[PDB]
From Swiss-Prot, chains A, B:
NCBIfam families linked: histidine_hisI, PRK00400.1-1
Catalytic class of the enzyme: hydrolase
Entry-linked InterPro entries: HisE (IPR008179), PRib-ATP_PPHydrolase-like (IPR021130)
Biological processes annotated in GO: L-histidine biosynthetic process; response to host iron concentration
Catalytic reaction equation(s): 1-(5-phospho-beta-D-ribosyl)-ATP + H2O = 1-(5-phospho-beta-D-ribosyl)-5'-AMP + diphosphate + H(+)
Listed pathway(s): Amino-acid biosynthesis; L-histidine biosynthesis; L-histidine from 5-phospho-alpha-D-ribose 1-diphosphate: step 2/9
Gene name of the record: hisE
Domain of life: Bacteria
Subcellular location: Cytoplasm
Protein name: Phosphoribosyl-ATP pyrophosphatase
Family: Belongs to the PRA-PH family.
Organism listed in the record: Mycobacterium tuberculosis (strain ATCC 25618 / H37Rv)
Amino acid sequence: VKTFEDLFAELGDRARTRPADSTTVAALDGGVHALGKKLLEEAGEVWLAAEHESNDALAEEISQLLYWTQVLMISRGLSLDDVYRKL
Amino acid sequence: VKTFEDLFAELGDRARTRPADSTTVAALDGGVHALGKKLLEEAGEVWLAAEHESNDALAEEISQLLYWTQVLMISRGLSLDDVYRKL
């Protein structure tokens, strides 16, 4: 992954092809409420890591926060442009 | 996926590259006991579907049983050849 968009394109492909190995597929089938919960959990993990853990551990939790944010975007039908226009 | 081996090669790639979206990664990190449990659950789902559900529903559950069988093989370090030599 070179850009935020590389992952986003990948997850869109996973939603199309629905491979057995894709976490995104089950998450997208599973509804928005569970996605919001997961995102909040990960924000807590990020805070813990930011305060108390290594750079690597923090990078790991941030990567998961970014992942779940993208899954939520796809669940609600948002594009990268929808978000990027506000930055 | 054209052959059992296509999926197996894919899951091996996922174990190498460890993408955020891969169910296999978390499962491989998570230990054999949880994998055995998942496999048994899926065998039960397959039986239910075989007795009571559509061909499509049965194909779905079988595909998941095959997936978890492959994840277990990778967890324990088995090759396709290790299994295929016994068929």
